[PDB]
Symmetry: D2
Subunit: 446 residues, 4 copies
């Protein structure tokens, strides 16, 4: 089958020379990356079986007499309504090409992996700016929502309610794409925004090629940005956020929280105003008590102080985000900082340097409490990232098949705390969607 | 408390002379109607329950130095977020006044009650036109959804799923306002419209002063029209529709159904193309079996051919509507009719003449199978209208308290079927939302 | 020939009943008025020969299968570009129907001629409001421009330059439609507005059925309002104006100035802030000296104080209008008055009562200086109005043909001043466009 | 004085790093180019006359606490109204920086001067695309207008009349910026567009750094593009055009004409459909007689068939353009070409290679009738380009002051015709605006 799509944006202005350049066999890595990201978006209705299921799917950007076409060959039929692609999906496909070509033409893999801290931040800024994500005529308004991909009905309803109350305050939502808690808040917000007659409500999705197949963008996402890697996505979250709401989740939400806390612990960041709320329904009380205990036992009370826990109160969560926008606006003004990008935030290179989750790199992590606590948070971040990769990313699953489980080790008492945390994730269904068993991609050496 | 609202529409250009006129003793009934309709909109989130709970609520239209203001005095607090009126609620309040003054200035009560069929039809047209509801450059896209105010979770989810799929087909939603099945489809469509990047989605609510407190408008409605009475609301539904979806419901939904089948049985209406779908989840199969059987044994197996029943298939419902629009378009074109208003539909005055729910009038109904089927449908419409009024309308409740239950009588076997249907509505929780006991305002004389 | 035009506005929503009502022989006066106003607009590329030139022109509003059409039969071909009506002309035709039907359905000729002062002002307000002329979210911005229909190249260029400088300040222009000084400022302003990237620049045309054929709306007019008569047009000018610019002109511009000055002389209007500038090119110095002398010799220095004369300085004229907007804004705020309509302005019924320019009524005017000077201005207004009517209006030219010239009399010294003023108008080509002789429709009895 | 301008476009998102880069010694020539191009835009209302008059003018792009600011230091006061920058001027300043940084970052001087034909063509495409000038969903509507900067009142009025009639046909205008015939059509079109209610009318100005001070952009231009050099400006003209109107002019207009005829004579261009109209008022008949004769006696009577001459008929010019668009549309469709960019037009490198106006290069031109006609046209293009540069460009004026007049030589009879044409340009006041004497920067060796 063939869907020959006429792009409405910049793709419609590619020259024959540019198309020939993209189709050159020397450019196949970039062209394949595009194909793979298109598939993730089209199949949103984890990487080791979905890339093997639509093996016959291909793209072909081609100049026809009537103009440039994006041909989709054997696409998921769920992306179409009477053989016409869902309009939001079309927009997301054009977004995908935009980001892949922009990054591919400006930055080498050496730039992206091995540049200094300042350069890696500028890369994040440059990609966001080209995506038209950054609006200098807007006051703080963006709430980043983090949470589990795999959550029950009670938890899911709670995320929708929180999103609804946030939308009623006229605030926008940014998530990392995907099901569960990364979609619910956006759906809820669409209701809040409609009641408030909000035009141009912003639903920001930030992703990267490694995670996009496992956590794919729903077409309610109206601004999609593909960052080059997981570290640049994390940086995009914290540079764009004006507030952060964190629901219960698994290893991915564990990774984001440790990223966030490790950075905010930094002496240079004590000045920051950035409201962070951990929140869930009444049933999540035990979850949050134990997570708060984990944070205290690992990186200390200097980190526990950075957030507030609100249980079973969607209106209060939204009130906190709303009061927070005023404090953030005041912070950026007083600091000579932009509303649209938090330049004053100080992110150490241990939080930016791209981590390749191999068995050697995972074993080399220093998980002991005689470290500066910011360094401990950095390595804990990398450790959760390896677990995410071994669970859902294509290359990560490959590492598990050739070497077996990752070995995570460190100080006895800390590894005992980590072992309990991860067991709780498995037990609560947080590591994998229902329907089959979860086999851990890791072992914690206690 | 006081909320002093600055109107953005025509209320902003009322003169002092005109405000004085509205506040005159001669217009006191009309000004109260406005106060009562405002209250219904503000406390949306039965017409004798909330009126004794907001006795202190008042409105006051006044010219101030900075312009005309709508003062809400002791309004329901749910209508406000941080002390500012929800924007859509302000839009609803403005449409209430628009309709009340329009009707109040052009049509006397005698005109509304006693005019000929064509005049009544032109009254409905006039109000809808004034409300800016009629769009001459749009092809058929309006789906009317009817169903119960008191439905369970399975039924509510199905209404949202259906609304979603209709929204994916780019179509608009019209309901009678209020909770349950009159709310679900709008919520679903919002998401479907979002995926399809639909600009200017229409969520049309049609109501009237008698029913509005019992079925109050949700701010998700972005075009509200208040018709003078229930009969004119019903005419609005069937003249604006391009397709009708009917979910399980109680007495209101039955009133609507018999109104529709009654009119569609007409000789002059055999030409009409109007898709009608009765639909519900898997668990509603028994309900529709019994409903279909009721129709066939009252108004005949001919009337059963006017609709298709679809159980447990939301995409199929939307496909049937989408295909239906093409036939509706062809029908209107073939007949030289308007897309925006079905002028060719023949509505007999027995469906238009406003029915006052009194014991006198209910007992004088001819519920006999030897009545011509169109006339039986019109009298069944009236009987259902009386149950609605007895249950939830202020002046219907008056008759019940002063004279006891309505008595409904007719031919023995027809009364036994009616008794069975109404018993099934009571049993399935359709006559009243959970909390208190339902006390029947009727007794079927078997 | 037939141009069958599909209207884009409310005309597209007329019912067959409404069309039959309009076409009834009892409604032919109203339908003919429409026809006549359509012709004036279509022939903009004085009434005694243009109504006789397109005798075969007719309108036919008709319901076709595809919708309501405005059929134009034998229209001026200048209104069309390849047999497609100029879009601005279409909009003006729809405006024409809107105003004629609104006034025709709400007000009898008895209302319009014989109502009290307050009622006649409300009529003006009601028609403007229905025309959507009044915008309560705008601060003062409207400059009314008055001047000669028949002016030379130097004078015309000057009006364009003034309009350009006004447009550069973001101010809008209101004129009474027609050639010469009533078009130039709008053309100039279109350039100023474009340079300032003004969206929704407002070009307001105010006319009435008597003068519309002689001074017809150019399609650069983007808001056209037809008032019922010349007095209601004059009232519309002064109720809408936030500033007034007056160029050299003939009897029509003489009429407007005397209207304006007579009102502003009133004790109740001394409070008003309303910048009035008389202005022209260097050649107009003698003109303005003599007009200023006429004002002094008739109504006194109490009137000369109400305006400033600026010669040969388009930038200063615009600066004065711009400073004036601030003073007008301050006036309306301090007075609890609207920005969009000057309600506080006090207009005596001598300025409102519709004057029928018959020979008996003209001779009955009291043109002596032992009157209150406001009453003298009122009668001077009526006298200039009779001259305009006898020169260019259809009924006025008829009065001249059956009775000969109007006889204007009064006090010797005053009539000598008037005789010199009118001779100067004739001498300067101000009474009639070039190409034929002007024969005065009046005699001043000296 | 200081005007600190807040940019609304991409300049608002320059980073401190990027501003530091622009201010580096390595980018000094580029930053000056921006200053010089800003000055030209600000003092619009020859490239050595105004540069010595605003020596104190400077620009300064700086990050302030409230955002990025464009400081204009001692700017021309004409660019300001009450101290605020004219909005369209701000838009022009923003487009200048957009183009200067785009070209400056992607193309070295060697690339611009020395690349192959296809690369040069792609450079023009790239800049126009970046400028958002290319619209893939629009059918042909762009009329390029060429003509003299120094024209009398009769000629200027005719250009406005032509612009008016083109605007009435719904078409857009492209010029080379500057006064006279490059200003008139835009002013006329504004009015024509206004009558036709054209939303988003396009007034495209194409310029380059050498010519911009001599022909500075009027703020009526709403899309400005600065191309790297005159040859690329010329390519932009002919690749964007859907029709060309050529008014009387001097050396610049002659350069343009011979460029066009030179390219249209190509074998590969015989397929092209591009309406070309030479037009002027009644008084220009002699000019066009002599011009037509010059063309026939230099490049042949074949080349004369490429254009139609229309004298004294603006409506006929617009009709010929409007009909032309239909043929242009059909041509592009038949050939599988774009509407927005004429990719099929063949442009020989002799028309593309940037020509530096030096005595060496001018004398090395082959102006002989036994040259192939395309090559003669390309060398005549170069000769006219040298007169333009000698008259009005900074570095062209350099060569004249250091080495005296250019000598132009070739075959005796061709030189005698060239001498005659240039003498006629000087005599008719076309080489220089009134005020001072024109001193020829050339001598034709006869």
């Amino acid at each position: 089958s063939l869907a020959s799509i006429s792009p409405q944006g910049s793709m419609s202005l590619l020259s024959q020379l540019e198309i020939e350049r993209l189709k050159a066999s020397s450019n196949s890595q970039l062209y394949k990356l595009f194909r793979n990201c298109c598939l993730a978006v089209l199949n949103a209705g984890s990487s080791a079986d979905i890339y093997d299921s639509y093996k016959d799917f291909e793209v072909n950007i081609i100049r026809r007499e009537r103009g440039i076409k994006l041909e989709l060959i054997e696409p998921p039929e769920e992306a179409f309504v009477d053989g016409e692609v869902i309009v939001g999906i079309r927009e997301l496909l054009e977004s995908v090409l935009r980001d892949i070509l922009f990054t591919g033409e400006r930055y080498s893999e050496t730039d992206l992996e091995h540049a200094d801290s300042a350069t890696l931040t500028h890369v994040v800024f440059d990609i966001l700016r080209n995506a038209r994500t950054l609006r200098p005529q807007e006051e703080p308004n963006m709430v980043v929502c983090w949470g589990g991909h795999s959550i029950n009905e009670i938890e899911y309803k709670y995320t929708k309610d929180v999103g609804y109350h946030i939308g009623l305050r006229g605030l926008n939502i940014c998530t990392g794409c995907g099901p569960g808690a990364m979609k619910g808040p956006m759906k809820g917000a669409t209701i809040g925004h409609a009641k408030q007659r909000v035009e141009g409500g912003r639903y920001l999705g930030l992703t990267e090629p490694g995670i996009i197949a496992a956590e794919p963008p729903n077409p309610i996402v109206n601004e999609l940005v593909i960052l080059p890697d997981i570290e640049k996505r994390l940086e995009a979250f914290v540079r764009c956020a004006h507030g952060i709401v964190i629901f219960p989740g698994g290893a991915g939400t564990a990774e984001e929280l440790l990223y966030l806390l490790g950075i905010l612990m930094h002496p240079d960041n004590q000045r920051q105003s950035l409201p962070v709320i951990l929140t869930g329904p009444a049933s999540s009380r035990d979850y949050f008590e134990a997570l708060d205990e984990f944070i205290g036992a690992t990186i200390g009370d200097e980190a526990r102080q950075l957030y507030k826990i609100i249980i079973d109160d969607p209106a209060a969560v939204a009130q906190h985000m709303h009061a927070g926008m005023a404090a953030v606006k005041q912070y950026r003004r007083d600091s000579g900082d932009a509303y649209y990008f938090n330049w004053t935030l100080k992110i150490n290179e241990e939080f930016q340097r791209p981590f390749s989750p191999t068995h050697e790199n995972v074993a080399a992590l220093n998980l002991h409490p005689d470290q500066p606590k910011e360094r401990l948070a950095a390595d804990l971040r990398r450790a959760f990232s390896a677990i995410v990769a071994g669970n859902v990313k294509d290359e990560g699953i490959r590492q598990i098949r050739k070497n077996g489980v990752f070995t995570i080790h460190g100080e006895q008492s800390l590894m005992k705390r980590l072992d309990e945390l991860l067991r709780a994730f498995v037990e609560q269904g947080r590591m994998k969607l229902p329907g089959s068993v979860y086999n851990p991609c890791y072992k914690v050496i206690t």
